[PDB]
Structures are given as structure tokens and as C-alpha cells.
């Protein structure tokens, strides 16, 4: 109930005029009181529509101001959207900044004038510095200045931070006022005509610099900001990658005293094991050269910060480094050209001096792995292999974005990238032809996409036809099935929904053991991803072909084989200005259904091939090997204790043993630590990488202004947990400014606190971080029933596409490929089912969601609706509440710290209860209905549909299930078995969890099976109503925990819930109408 006050002050601050008026609107769930609210509303609207003072009535109707609930505030004020300058003249008395063109390697990557690089606007492109975000610089500056004004009178350590950031913003604003403000278009892009007389790379630096200075809480932060802001104005290609590089060595210097362990994906079990740090001499010399480059770049304070820590090499002072390690990824992207980003990868040194004894072994291991993967399904003749075509045709929605192609649905034209729609287009003209695999050559080279991530290189993406997916699908899914239980496929091992977060290193770390960890991200254009890899797979297919008797399967295999033939020679469309290059690339990269797991395989085979050479000189027991995409690590234990000389000689031998296969590497050997893209360990303590740029994005998504605020807040929460902490108030200011909407030149709308933090499809953040907030009142239910009434919408584009000819053809081919003679009973069901996966197509979502926003807007303006009894969550909590009883408790300290970078209160929680140990099927994958879905498809279906589907009669369930590609015999058998009744509870668990972000964010990190949490929750057991006792125990846990978070102390509980209300609620259970947005979730592991 505080956000809105800051909103009011922002409104008062930004406009400031007599003519600037401020117009609240309220609502209440009580009829009489609502009519008085309507009255107040009316009179206020009138007064607003008559240039009358509004401030007088506000006292008379004080009751509405105190007890009624706000929605939004409008603002009518005359201005020509400037105001930044009109405030800013005072805050700009520092010195402006001068570029240095001889910093970046290229010439055009310097921050020189646009016209000196793009004289004509017809050849201009802002994409090499496009922020790619629907939020203005003016918004950012306005937010900063209002923040600065309000935090101008606090007197504490907070003020010492304020003076620091104030000095920084002076340094910034002097530089900005030197030239001026770039002006946004409707799309928040910046055209040539504003930047025409200004430096090209001023905007991203500006935005990134704002992002940095808003994340200053300490003295060392101020040092970092002063040392980066002035150097990030020039270096834009070798900076975050640079300073973030020494960390990989630093982790190998901290003696472990106390450890954390894995068994199964979150089984934590601490260990007091001690391990020393046997560092060689030459890695220090490597580090010194890196520091010489660091100083050569213009760095003074950060060598000192790296130098004064080494006197002790203690882990208590070490988080500074970790803090620093996240500041490298909050400086921005190196948004260079597709070409030049490829040429970071497309430099090759291929030699006829490597072994042949090695590649054959490599190929064989790949072959053997393929056979291990594919022995069972190829042999037992699974339906999904026979009907691979239909399988891929269902799983088109889970594919990549194909190249743009011109379609027409009756009487329109569309440029879709969705490959299912491409197939639909090709069906009409007789072009659907999955048996004839297209070539990939001079006559038809491939387009590209770029997978970026700051502080690292750019990876590439194939953009293929629709046959390749179909070919790779079935085989790769069976491979995945094999890979669910194989440990070494780290990206693919699971307990059917999890990826192993905290590694598998710490079991056997010791004074006698070592670990070799290695980045393999440049190994895409390499000489070991060409011919042997593919031919090994082809050989494996030959073996598998001789390991089966069915003919459909052999057809599939021969087509997949020929696909691998075509992928062995593959050319690549790449523009450069106007003309187009096509380059010989007969090798492997990302952008495929096969690439990820296959790269994991290939790296596994490669390292297995490398690993047979240390054995010529050392005896070790391979305890573990791991591969996850762009890195891999193997730990090994010896017959004796380790020395410096053995590590050095092993390292040189490893480097040269990669050199024998013509393979570059920064080889890294250690005893205690690793560093990889997504996480890293030092001294038996897990840290993480906080690298998500906020004001600069990777690529241009499809979301609105609205949802990008929610994703940015989710990323904020994540980065905060990682360690990189930004001031939450700034984020809130941005959220209000991005959900604010301009209806005219002078009308602007501003939503409120109780709309963005309320459980709906529009939730954005929370009033108290790490805690969803609920509604004990009528009013949150009331507006939720309204928004649920409005969430269900239509897309006329989808309606007319489903009424076209291509849709009919598609349905006909589906039918005659599966079954016939129920042309008016199921086929309509199948059309309705295909609709469920047309909605993946983005413009449909835009139509639907913009429609949702318009419908939303026509009741944000005007008063409220009673919404007709539709039960939701807050009704339940409203009814559960009057049977509680609180009591003061006092818990002890019994859990060990292993995530220092958390806030100390979060750690206090962790230092009193446990960390999570399971991961519940948030999508119901282990459910026996889903083990059918995972048998005939990969598709998710969302928990809205499932939660509804189980509630229906036994008739339309049959139609709905048969419509999903499933045959009739197994569906009938499923209905007879009655396992869905054994799955109401799992589905409801997943439903409530998805609604309440229990497996998404801070609550994803917590053990609800704990004994420590349970002894406070003294809810006796009744039985034969599982839903109630489940939800009661859960809600009570949340109550105690929220009380703990906000107040520190603990409490116990008690709920003698009457059986009468149990029965009254049992019928209210399976008619709930609620929903949470996918875009609001914040996965700590991305």
C-alpha cells in the first residue's frame, strides 16, 4: 500500500503545473458503498471535464479515500513530451567524455558520428546499437531524476550511497547535455534523423551506464562505476569478456574448508571435507599478462582490487571478486554484424598432420553410443518410429522460426516464420513432400540466426526446411529417452523434470585428486565436427538398419542417413549490405533439433578420445566426466598425492594432445574450482553468474510493453539472488512508467499497486520480494473474476485461417493418414485441437492480447462489475482464515551457509530451514496420462486446459483425447482404467504451484517436506479429502514463512477446520477459474 504514494509524487514532480491535474478512480465490493463510490466517481469525472479544482471534495468523501480500493490515475497536462531538459540543467556541471577510436579492433565499432559511417539514411541501420527494448531513454532519465529528488534528505549510510550515485549521474549528465537527447518513435527505436549529428554508440552506453550506476550500494561499487563508465564509452568488443576471464583461474586458489554435495539433483548433504590448492607457477604469469592487458586498457583500481586480495587468498573477503564477476555482464552486448560475428568463428586452420588412429576411434565411440541409444526402440518397433512423419507434424510447434515466406489465407498475405504454417502452405500446392529431402548447396544455401549472450562469443543458428525436423525428431527423442538416465549428459539427465543445478564435482575433491575443466564454445567450426562425426552416425545407422526387420523404419533411417549426407555439405546465405555471400560450411552448429544433444555426444566422444593419453604417464581412476554444451569437466583421483610439477606437465601434455588433433584450448586444471557460463564454485561454496542486461536485450522478441516489464523484474529478482543487486525502487518506477499509457497528447494513464502484484494474467511484481501476495478481501476476487471473464478472447485471423482451404486440406490429410469414417464427430475435435497449437503463432497472441488490453481498458476507465459468483483462490483463503491460531515461537540455528551472495535475511531463512530436495511435476510429466503424451508426442498441454479437462463428463474427455493424435483403443482403455481420477490431485498440485510460482523463483528453492517447517504447522490429519489438507498445510507454511521474512520471528499454528466447511468446499474445488501469466515467472536457472 505504498507504491501508489510514490506514483503520486512522481506525477506531481514530472508535470508540476497548475494545469497538471491528477484524477484517481476507486472501487468497492459493497453495493451501497459502491453506489457512493460511483457518485464520487461521477462528480470527479465531471469536475475533471470542467477544469474545476478536485482537491476540495477529497476531504468530504474521506471514507472512499481510506477504505475503497484504487485502480489507476489519469493525468491531463499540456506539454510537448520534453521536460527532461527543463529539470536537468542543474545536474550537469561535471566534465563531458571524449572517445578513443584506437580501442576497438574495427573502425566502425568506435563511437564516432553516424554520418561518418552511414551518410545516407537509406543504408542506415540502428541494429548495431539498437537497445531492442520498449522503453525510452526519457523514461529512464525521468526515473533517475525523481529518485534523486526524493532521496535528497535521508541521512545515513543510504545518503553516502546517494552522494556517490549523485556524483556519477553528474558525470553522466555533463556528457549527455553536451549533445542532447535522442527522441523515440512509436516503437521506441531511434532513427537516423535524431542521431544524424551525434555519435553512433552513445545510446547503448548511456542505457548501460544508467543500469550500472543504479546498482551502486558500496564504495567499491563507486570505484567500479567510475572505472567502467569512462572506458565503456570506447571499448565495446573486448571488455566484459576480458575482465570476466581471470575468474576461471581464481576459483583454483581457495582452499576448501566445508563443502556441499549432490546425490539426485537437489539432494544436499554438507561435508566438512578440507582440500588444499596446488597452483602452478606459470598460471600466475598468465594472470600477470592478463593484468598487463587490463592496465593497458586504462584500469587502475581493479588490478589493485585483484592484487590486495592475494595476500591472504581468503574466502571471506572473496565475494567482492564474485560481485565484480557479475559487474562484467551488466555493461551490454557487442552488437556487431552477422558477418563479423561469424568471422570470430569462421577462421580455420585445417591440417593434414593429425592422426588417423584418433579419428577412427572417435567415430567408433560415436557409433557405439548411437547403438546404445537406439538398440531398444529400433528393435521393438515402436509406433512413434513408424509414424515419425505424423509425430514431427504434431511437434512442429516446438521447432525453430523458419525463414520468412509469403503465404495467403484466402484473401490476405502473411510472412510467418512458423514452420507448421509453412507446411500448411506447402500442402495446398502439392509441395508437402517429406520423402524427398531438399539439398543444401549452392542452389539453396541456408539463412542464419545469431545466439548472443554478453561477455562471450556469438553462436550461430541454422534456419532449415521442414523435412529436416521431421527426419531428426523421432531418433533424437529416443536418444533423449536414453539420455534421461545417463548421468554424463548433464543438459539431459533428469528425474524426468530437472536439470542438475549444483554440479557433481564435490564428492571426490581432495588433496589427492584433481579436475580438468575446459571451455569448448569455439569448437563449432572445428575440424572434428566435419566428416568423421557424420560418417560415424551413418555407420551407426547401418548397424541399426541391420538390427531391424520393419520397412517403414528402414525408410525413416535411410532418409535420416541422407539428411546427414546433406548436412555434410551445407552452404549458408549471409548478406553484406546489398549483395549476398554463400560459403562452404560442411560441419555442425546449433539451430537444429539434433544439435544440442549431438554436440554433447560429440564433446563426450572428443574428450573420451583425448583422455586415453594421460594414461600413458599417470594412473588415475576416472570418477566423473561431464559435458553441458559450451564446456566440460572431468575429475580424477590418483594412487598418490598431487604436486605442482605433475599439474604443469599434465597441462602441457593435455594442450599438446589437443594440438595433435589440431584443436585450440585454454586448458585449465585445478583441485577445488571451476568456472563455466552458468555457475562456478570456490572453496566449497556455490556462486552464480548474474549476467542479464536489463536496458539492452539479446534480440527483438514479440512481447508488449507490458510483459517485458515483468520479464525484466523476473531477471532483476534472479540477478539479485545471484548477487548483483540493483535498487528495487528504480525498477518499480520503470514498471509504472512502462504500464503508463498515453491516450492523447495530454492524457496519460497510470495503473496502481493492487493491479500489478495481484494474482492474474497481468501480475508483474510483488509488494514484498520473494513473496506472492494474496487477497483476504472481496475486492481481489472481484477484479480477478472480472479479468478471468476478459482473458478468454478470440483472434479473427485465427478464425479465418481455420476457415480457409489449407486448414481443410491439413485436416483431410491428418484424417486419411490416421482414420476415416467419423468425419463429423472427431475431425471437428481435431480441428479444435490444432487450434490449441496455432496459438503459439505470435500475431494471433498479439491480436488476442491487444484485444484483452482494450477490453481491460474499457473497465479501468469506468466502474466495476459483480462478475457472477466465479470462485477463485482468494475466496478460499477468505473462508479458511477464521479457523487459525497463532503462537510465538523461537527456532534455533542448525543449517550451514553455502550461498554467501544472498541477502542475510534470505540466508537466515536458509540458516534455519533446509533447501529443496524434490521438484514436483509442474507440468505433470510423471503422470501416467503424460507418460502417454510423452509416448505419442512431446507436447505440454497447459495446466489451464488440463485442470478443466479432468472436471468434465466421461464423454467429451474421449473426444478431446482422441483429437490429440492418440488412437481410440488406448483412450478407451485409459478411460476404463480410471487413472485420471488418480491424477486430479497431481494436476491440482501443479495448477496451484503454477498459479503461485512455487516452482518459479524464490519458492522454487525451498523444502516443503521439511521437519523444521512441519513442527510449527500443527494441523492434525483427518483423511479422505486430500485437496483440503494439502492446501491448508501449504497456506499455513506460507503464512509462517511470510511472517518470518517480514519480521524474523517464528510462530506455530493450529486449524481445527470443521467438517461442515470441508464438505462445503469439496464441491467448490473443481470449478476454479484462475490463471497466471507465463511471462511473470523468474527461473533462477536459465
Amino acid at each position: 500500500g505504498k507504491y501508489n504514494l510514490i506514483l503520486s509524487e512522481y506525477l506531481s514532480f514530472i508535470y508540476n503545473s497548475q494545469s497538471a491535474v491528477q484524477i484517481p478512480i476507486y472501487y468497492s465490493s459493497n453495493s451501497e458503498l459502491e453506489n457512493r463510490c460511483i457518485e464520487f466517481h461521477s462528480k470527479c469525472l465531471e469536475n475533471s471535464k470542467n477544469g474545476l479544482s478536485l482537491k476540495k471534495l477529497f476531504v468530504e468523501y474521506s471514507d472512499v479515500i481510506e477504505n475503497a480500493t484504487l485502480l489507476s490515475i489519469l493525468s491531463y497536462s499540456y506539454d510537448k513530451y520534453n521536460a527532461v531538459e527543463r529539470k536537468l540543467v542543474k545536474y550537469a556541471k561535471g566534465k563531458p567524455l571524449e572517445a578513443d577510436l584506437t580501442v576497438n579492433e574495427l573502425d566502425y565499432e568506435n563511437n564516432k558520428i553516424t554520418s561518418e559511417l552511414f551518410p545516407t539514411a537509406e543504408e542506415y541501420t540502428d541494429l548495431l546499437m539498437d537497445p531492442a527494448i520498449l522503453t525510452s531513454l526519457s523514461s529512464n532519465l525521468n526515473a533517475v531524476m525523481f529518485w534523486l529528488e526524493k532521496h535528497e534528505n535521508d541521512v545515513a549510510e543510504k545518503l553516502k550511497i546517494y552522494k556517490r550515485r549523485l556524483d556519477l549521474f553528474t558525470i553522466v549528465a555533463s556528457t549527455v547535455n553536451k549533445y542532447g537527447v535522442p527522441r523515440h518513435n512509436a516503437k521506441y527505436r531511434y532513427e537516423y534523423e535524431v542521431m544524424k549529428d551525434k555519435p553512433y554508440y552513445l545510446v547503448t552506453w548511456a542505457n548501460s551506464s544508467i543500469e550500472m550506476l543504479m546498482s551502486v550500494f558500496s564504495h567499491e561499487d563507486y570505484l567500479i562505476a567510475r572505472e567502467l563508465i569512462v572506458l565503456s564509452y570506447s571499448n565495446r568488443s573486448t571488455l566484459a569478456k576480458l575482465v570476466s576471464s581471470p575468474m576461471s583461474i581464481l576459483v583454483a586458489l581457495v582452499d576448501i574448508n566445508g563443502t556441499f554435495i549432490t546425490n539426485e539433483e537437489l539432494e544436499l548433504e554438507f561435508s566438512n571435507k578440507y582440500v588444499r590448492a596446488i597452483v602452478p607457477d606459470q598460471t600466475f604469469d598468465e594472470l600477470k599478462q592478463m593484468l598487463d592487458n587490463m592496465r593497458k586498457a586504462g584500469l587502475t583500481d581493479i588490478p589493485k582490487m585483484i592484487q590486495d586480495w592475494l595476500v591472504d587468498c581468503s574466502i571471506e573477503k572473496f565475494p567482492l571478486m564474485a560481485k565484480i564477476y557479475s559487474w562484467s555482464f551488466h555493461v551490454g552486448f557487442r552488437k556487431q554484424k552477422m558477418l563479423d560475428a561469424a568471422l570470430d568463428q569462421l577462421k580455420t586452420e585445417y591440417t593434414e598432420d593429425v592422426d588417423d588412429e584418433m579419428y577412427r576411434e572417435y567415430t567408433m565411440l560415436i557409433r557405439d553410443e548411437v547403438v546404445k541409444m537406439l538398440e531398444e526402440p529400433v528393435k521393438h518397433d515402436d509406433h512413434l518410429l513408424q509414424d515419425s512423419e505424423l509425430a514431427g507434424l504434431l511437434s512442429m510447434s516446438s521447432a525453430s522460426n523458419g525463414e520468412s515466406r509469403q503465404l495467403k489465407f484466402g484473401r490476405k498475405t502473411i510472412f510467418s516464420t512458423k514452420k507448421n504454417m509453412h507446411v500448411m502452405d506447402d500442402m495446398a500446392n502439392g509441395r508437402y513432400t517429406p520423402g524427398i529431402i531438399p539439398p543444401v548447396n549452392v542452389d539453396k544455401p541456408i539463412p542464419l540466426g545469431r545466439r548472443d549472450v554478453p561477455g562471450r562469443r556469438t553462436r550461430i543458428i541454422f534456419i532449415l526446411p521442414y523435412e529436416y525436423f521431421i527426419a531428426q525428431h523421432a531418433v533424437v527423442e529416443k536418444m533423449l529417452i536414453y539420455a534421461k538416465h545417463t548421468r554424463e549428459y548433464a543438459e539431459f539427465y533428469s528425474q524426468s523434470n530437472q536439470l542438475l543445478s549444483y554440479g557433481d564435482v564435490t564428492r571426490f575433491l581432495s588433496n589427492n585428486s584433481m579436475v580438468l575443466y575446459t571451455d569448448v564454445s569455439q569448437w563449432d567450426s572445428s575440424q572434428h565436427n566435419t566428416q568423421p562425426f557424420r560418417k560415424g552416425i551413418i555407420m551407426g545407422l547401418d548397424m541399426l538398419a541391420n538390427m531391424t526387420n520393419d520397412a517403414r523404419v528402414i525408410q525413416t533411417l535411410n532418409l535420416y542417413k541422407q539428411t546427414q549426407i546433406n548436412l555434410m555439405d551445407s552452404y549458408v546465405q549471409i548478406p553484406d549490405g546489398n549483395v549476398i555471400k554463400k560459403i562452404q560450411y560442411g560441419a555442425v552448429a546449433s539451430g537444429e533439433k539434433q544439435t544440442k544433444a549431438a554436440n554433447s555426444i560429440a564433446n563426450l566422444a572428443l574428450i573420451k578420445t583425448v583422455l586415453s593419453r594421460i594414461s600413458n604417464k599417470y594412473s588415475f581412476a576416472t570418477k566423473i566426466i561431464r559435458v553441458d554444451g559450451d564446456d566440460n569437466y572431468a575429475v580424477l583421483q590418483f594412487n598418490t598425492e598431487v604436486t605442482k610439477q605433475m599439474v604443469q606437465d599434465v597441462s602441457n601434455d593435455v594442450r599438446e594432445t589437443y594440438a595433435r588433433m589440431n584443436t585450440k584450448v585454454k586448458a585449465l586444471v585445478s583441485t577445488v574450482g571451476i568456472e563455466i557460463a552458468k555457475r562456478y564454485i570456490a572453496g566449497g561454496k556455490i556462486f552464480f553468474r548474474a549476467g542479464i542486461n536489463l536496458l539492452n536485450n539479446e534480440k527483438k522478441g514479440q512481447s508488449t510493453q507490458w510483459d517485458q516489464a515483468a520479464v525484466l523484474y523476473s531477471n532483476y529478482i534472479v540477478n539479485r539472488l545471484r548477487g548483483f543487486e540493483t535498487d528495487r525502487e528504480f525498477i518499480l518506477t520503470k514498471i509504472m512508467q512502462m504500464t503508463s499509457v498515453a491516450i492523447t497528447g495530454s492524457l496519460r494513464l497510470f495503473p496502481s499497486e493492487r493491479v500489478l502484484t495481484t494474482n492474474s494474467t497481468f501480475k508483474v511484481f510483488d509488494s514484498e520480494d520473494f513473496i506472492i501476495e494474496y487477497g483476504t478481501t472481496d475486492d481481489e476476487v472481484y477484479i480477478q473474476r472480472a479479468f478471468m471473464s476478459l482473458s478468454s478472447q478470440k483472434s479473427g485471423i485465427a478464425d479465418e485461417i481455420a476457415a480457409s482451404s489449407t486448414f481443410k486440406n491439413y485436416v483431410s490429410r491428418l484424417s486419411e493418414q490416421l482414420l476415416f469414417s467419423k468425419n463429423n464427430i472427431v475431425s471437428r475435435g481435431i480441428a479444435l485441437t490444432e487450434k490449441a497449437k496455432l496459438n503459439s503463432y505470435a500475431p494471433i497472441s498479439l491480436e488476442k492480447r491487444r484485444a484483452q488490453i482494450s477490453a481491460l481498458l474499457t473497465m479501468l476507465q469506468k466502474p466495476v462489475t459483480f462478475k457472477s459468483s466465479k470462485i477463485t483462490i482468494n475466496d478460499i483463503l477468505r473462508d479458511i482464515k477464521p479457523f487459525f491460531t497463532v503462537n510465538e515461537a523461537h527456532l534455533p540455528i542448525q543449517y550451514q551457509k553455502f550461498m554467501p551472495t544472498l541477502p542475510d535475511n534470505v540466508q537466515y531463512i536458509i540458516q534455519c530451514i533446509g533447501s529443496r530436495t524434490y521438484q514436483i511435476e509442474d507440468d505433470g510429466s510423471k503422470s501416467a496420462i503424460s507418460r502417454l503424451i510423452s509416448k505419442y508426442s512431446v507436447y505440454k498441454p497447459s495446466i489451464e486446459e488440463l485442470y478443466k479437462v479432468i472436471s468434465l463428463h466421461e464423454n467429451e474427455i474421449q473426444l478431446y483425447l482422441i483429437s490429440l493424435g492418440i488412437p481410440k483403443i488406448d483412450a478407451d482403455t485409459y478411460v476404463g482404467s480410471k487413472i485420471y481420477s488418480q491424477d486430479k490431485y497431481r494436476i491440482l498440485e501443479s495448477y496451484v504451484y503454477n498459479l503461485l510460482s512455487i516452482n518459479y523463483g524464490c519458492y522454487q528453492l525451498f523444502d516443503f517436506n521439511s521437519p523444521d517447517l512441519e513442527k510449527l504447522i500443527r494441523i492434525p490429519f483427518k483423511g479422505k479429502i486430500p485437496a483440503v489438507t494439502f492446501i491448508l498445510h501449504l497456506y499455513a507454511k506460507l503464512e509462517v514463512i511470510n511472517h518470518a521474512i517480514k519480521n524474523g520471528s517464528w510462530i506455530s499454528l493450529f486449524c481445527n477446520y470443521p467438517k461442515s466447511e470441508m464438505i462445503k468446499l469439496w464441491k467448490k474445488m473443481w470449478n476454479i477459474t484462475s490463471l497466471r501469466s507465463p511471462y511473470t515467472n523468474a527461473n533462477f536457472f536459465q
Partner: peptide, 28 residues
Amino acid sequence: NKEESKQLLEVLKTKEEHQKEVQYEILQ
């Protein structure tokens, strides 16, 4: 400055001494 840096290189030897190494070195 860098005189003290080379002294940092030297003083970052005495710390974190392994035992097997000094044994084999006395022997060697």
C-alpha cells in the same frame, strides 16, 4: 609500483606450500 609487484610474486610462493613437493625437492 612494479618492484613491489615482483615482491608479490615472491611472497606468493612461501604461502600455500605443499609437503610432498618439499620432500621430493630436498631429495632432488
